[PDB]
């Protein structure tokens, strides 16, 4: 119905930014949020309806030390949106108290659009883990989400950082953020900083500028994603029924994402299918099994050979696959989008689940206990003791992850009868 | 016989009663077919199996509501029946749709 | 041929507007320019006065729920009186729902026309009727554009609906289930005695809204998409009215084929009727494991006050009885939830296998479509 998102931190704002930017490049409209007199889609995803019709984007505007903020100020985008949902340290402790002491203001913004709107679908996050403005402040805000609304859904966006290796508490404040991701969100995008620094360096010879190009891609990735929602298709026009089919078990909520552009500056649907299967072709990084595999394709298709296409892949065996109930690769077409410029028309999407994640998992996992066993990086922060006296979260969020991994290691198994 | 005790018969049927374990029953069903037993109102068959077709196709019975127009072409050809309108409405009120189920009954 | 133009044209159509061997064969330089002049005339004017192009393509999105947007809001608007019996409802009811979803979604930036031609209607009622039953849109055909929406072609499009109805319905139950479990794993999360039924129950719905999420998409690019796109291509050729309509008889023949109105394959609808039956079912198991929590729950809650209403000890004797059948209800959970599951494998079983048994080509495609991992169909116990 009518999705509310939510971006917090400097990093949210910024890609949330790039967001709205990309999406009034993508639609016919102005900056000034005025349609064009040659404009169709469905604009009642996000885009709060003003009286004009100033297609307002849905988003809240949260910020800890304002200082791309102020960039975000002096734009010809800022005449875009602001619904007035502007406002006023970079670990988790103190981002978390922080946010405690203000929640009821933010809770005010968050009840001014939710009445606002017309109905309420869900909240989408724009998050980054361990982003030192983002951490803390979006664990708790999570917190208040799902506490204030059990009738509402909650999807997360969030980066994975790794940049080849500065904070070194950031195991701890990232153990604290994905402690709240497993068990207080509904649905996660899991992003990898190391994947797209890799393709980012393979399309260009950019390694410094990095943030605005791996903007561009995960643009196309969150647009890509609410495509079929804000297109008159058949399927998925909704999130809930997006996000149902691919989650066996609401602990596993985790998202791999694939995308076949790599270097963006006839065809057909059996040959991105296969080049899609190839993790080169995924932007994410024993035996590892798909849980379950969607995917869903734009561009120039005939679709009346796709299941000549689809006898081929069941044919192929190409991923082995999780030894129980039965998955499928799900195939999804959606319209190409009008009133932009379109080169390369075909771009295929992957949605699955996959088990290796829980090895990258495993990666904090080590690196959070040689830290936590040599005594040496909690730096006595001020916070972070008057918070917790006893240091037992570190704790609670180490027993989670280890039965989280757990259950990834028993959904290997063929049975997962057994407890996880 | 006659249609007094006729309707005796009847009570007969339906209640596991007899006629004098219960004519209370049977005084009821002389209170409305009495001042009803005559007809004085318009009645055409073509109307009331065209009726029953209707319902069938809503029961996805699909392959009896083609049986039943191969068996009421036999219901006016035998036609030793006087009303063959009062025993189809007659059905066709007393019916239920006790959903899909297809399958021909080979008449 | 020519005279069953012209006539057509001068009567029915109401144009006034002027149209004008050895015996050494005058009659074939003629004949054949005046059709070349007329036949393409009475398919121009007739489009530009009461659209045949139009109205079709709107049946599709609208009738034949090609939308998504629209029927979305459309049900949910319309979710009570339809889980009602609808033996106790009428049409003014249903009409009165429409005027909301056509302001709020995009079918305010279409053409009055069409809106103006979309209605509801009720049908004649069964005697046990529920909304889900029977229930239809109208959006009635009529004009002179009629001659392309045949009579028995409006009455197979209803008969369309229905099924199509139920299948769309089932995609918002069975997600309503979802979010139950979800709403009620995030309020039970530190009980350790109903996480073994309710990680039961989960994984007992997973494996639906999956089989029948790929069964959905079957329905779009074969039932749907190509058989519009048939329709496409023989309006776009046609020379004549009399192609118009045989497009149309294509655009019925390959929904209802693939739909298993057809004869043959009656015996497969039977048994999907059955899997929508048991997701019923779980939708009541769901959502009694979960009332059995809340009323743990609650007991939690009346427990936490006694002891501030005591000390300013004599409850936790009351306490453990309640623990105790709690923890002993766990078994009965887990043989109704096990029973459902095993009932729900053995019916997938014989559906997979029956459409490689089946008629025609099409329907074989939809058992690939449904497991690829070959979870089933190949090693029928759940591997």
Redesign the interface.
Same mark, same amino acid.
């Given at each position: 119905?009518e999705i509310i998102t939510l971006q917090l931190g400097q990093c949210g704002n910024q890609i949330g930014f790039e967001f709205w930017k990309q999406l009034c490049a993508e639609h016919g409209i102005s900056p000034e949020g005025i349609v064009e007199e040659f404009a169709?889609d469905?604009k !009642?995803v996000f885009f709060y309806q003003a009286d004009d019709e100033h297609y307002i984007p849905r988003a809240v505007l949260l910020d800890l030390e304002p200082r791309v903020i102020h960039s975000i100020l002096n734009s010809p985008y800022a005449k875009l949106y602001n619904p007035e949902n502007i406002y006023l340290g970079n670990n988790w402790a103190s981002g978390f108290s922080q946010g405690e002491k203000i929640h009821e203001d933010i809770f005010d913004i968050i009840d001014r659009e939710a009445d606002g709107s !017309?109905?309420l679908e869900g909240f989408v996050l724009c998050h980054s883990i361990a982003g030192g403005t983002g951490s803390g402040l979006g664990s708790y805000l999570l917190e208040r989400l799902?506490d204030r609304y059990?009738?509402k859904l909650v999807q997360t966006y969030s980066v994975f950082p790794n940049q080849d290796e500065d904070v070194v508490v950031q195991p701890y404040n990232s153990l604290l953020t994905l402690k709240r991701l497993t068990?207080?969100a509904?649905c996660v995008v899991v992003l990898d900083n190391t994947a797209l620094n890799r393709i980012a360096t393979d399309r260009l010879h950019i390694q410094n500028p990095s943030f605005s190009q791996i903007n561009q891609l995960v643009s196309t990735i969150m647009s890509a994603s609410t495509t079929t929602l804000r297109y008159?298709?058949?399927?998925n026009? !909704?999130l809930?029924?997006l996000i149902?089919?691919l989650? =066996?078990?609401?602990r596993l909520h985790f998202l791999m994402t694939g995308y076949t552009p790599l270097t963006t500056d006839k065809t057909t649907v059996l040959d991105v299918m296969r080049r899609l299967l190839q993790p080169k072709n995924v932007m994410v990084s024993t035996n590892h099994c798909y849980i379950?595999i969607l995917n869903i394709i734009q561009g120039e298709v005939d679709?009346?050979q796709?299941?000549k296409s689809?006898?081929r892949?069941?044919e192929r065996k190409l991923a082995n696959?999780?030894?129980?109930? =039965?998955?499928?690769?799900?195939?999804?077409?959606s319209r190409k989008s009008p009133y932009l410029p379109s080169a390369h028309r075909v771009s295929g999407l992957m949605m699955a689940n996959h088990t290796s994640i829980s090895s990258l998992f495993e990666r904090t996992c080590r690196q959070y206990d040689k830290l936590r066993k040599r005594e040496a990086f909690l730096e006595q922060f001020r916070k972070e003791d008057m918070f917790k006296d006893n240091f037992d979260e570190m704790d609670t969020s180490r027993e989670i992850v280890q039965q989280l991994i757990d259950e990834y290691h028993a959904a290997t198994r =063929?049975d997962?009868?057994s407890?996880? | 016989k006659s249609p007094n005790v006729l309707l005796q018969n009847l009570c007969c049927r339906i209640l596991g009663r007899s006629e004098a374990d219960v004519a209370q029953q049977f005084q009821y069903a002389v209170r409305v077919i009495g001042s009803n037993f005559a007809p004085t109102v318009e009645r055409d068959e073509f109307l009331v199996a065209e009726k029953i077709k209707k319902e069938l196709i809503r029961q996805r019975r699909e392959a009896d509501a083609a049986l039943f127009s191969e068996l009421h072409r036999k219901l006016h050809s035998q036609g030793v029946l006087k009303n063959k309108w009062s025993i189809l409405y007659l059905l066709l009120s007393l019916s239920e749709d006790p959903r899909r189920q297809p399958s021909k009954v080979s008449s | 041929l020519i005279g069953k133009s012209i006539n057509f044209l001068h009567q029915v159509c109401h144009d006034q507007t002027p149209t004008t061997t050895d015996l050494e064969n005058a009659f074939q330089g003629k004949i054949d320019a005046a059709y070349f002049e007329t036949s393409k005339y009475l398919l121009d004017v007739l489009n530009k006065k009461y659209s045949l192009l139009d109205h079709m393509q709107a049946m599709r999105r609208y009738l034949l729920l090609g939308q998504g947007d629209f029927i979305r809001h459309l049900m949910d608007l319309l979710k009570p009186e339809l889980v009602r019996p609808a033996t106790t409802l009428y049409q003014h009811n249903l009409t009165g729902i429409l005027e909301t979803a056509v302001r709020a979604t995009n079918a305010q930036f279409d053409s009055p026309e069409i809106l103006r031609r979309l209605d509801v209607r009720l049908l004649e009622v069964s005697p046990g009727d529920t909304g889900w039953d029977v229930f239809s849109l109208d959006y009635h055909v009529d004009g002179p554009i009629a001659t392309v929406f045949t009579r028995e072609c409006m009455s197979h499009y209803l008969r369309v609906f229905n099924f199509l109805w139920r299948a769309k319905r089932m995609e918002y139950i069975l997600t309503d289930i979802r979010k139950g479990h979800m709403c009620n794993a995030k309020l039970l999360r530190n009980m350790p005695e109903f996480s073994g039924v309710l990680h039961q129950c989960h994984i007992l719905a997973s494996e639906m809204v999956h089989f029948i999420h790929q069964m959905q998409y079957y329905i779009t690019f074969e039932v749907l998409e190509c058989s519009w796109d048939e329709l496409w291509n023989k309006v776009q050729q046609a020379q004549d009215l009399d192609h118009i309509i045989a497009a149309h008889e294509v655009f019925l023949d390959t929904i209802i084929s693939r739909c298993l109105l057809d004869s043959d394959s009656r015996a497969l609808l039977n048994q999907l009727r059955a899997v929508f039956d048991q997701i019923i079912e779980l939708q009541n198991a769901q959502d009694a494991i979960y009332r059995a929590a809340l009323e743990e729950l609650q007991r939690r809650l009346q427990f936490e006050e006694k002891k501030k209403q005591r000390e300013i000890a004599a409850e936790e004797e009351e306490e453990n009885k309640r623990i105790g059948e709690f923890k002993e209800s766990i078994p009965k959970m887990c043989s109704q939830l096990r029973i459902l599951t095993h009932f729900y494998q053995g019916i997938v079983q014989q559906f997979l296998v029956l459409l490689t048994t089946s008629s025609d080509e099409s329907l074989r495609f939809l058992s690939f479509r449904l497991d690829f991992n070959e979870h089933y169909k190949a090693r029928e116990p759940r591997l």
């Open positions: 119905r169709t469905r !009642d !017309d109905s799902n059990p009738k068990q207080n509904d008159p298709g058949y399927m026009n !909704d809930i029924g149902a089919s989650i =066996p078990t609401p379950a679709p009346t796709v299941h689809l006898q892949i069941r696959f999780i030894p129980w109930g =039965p998955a499928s690769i799900q195939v999804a077409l =063929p997962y009868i407890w996880g | - | -």
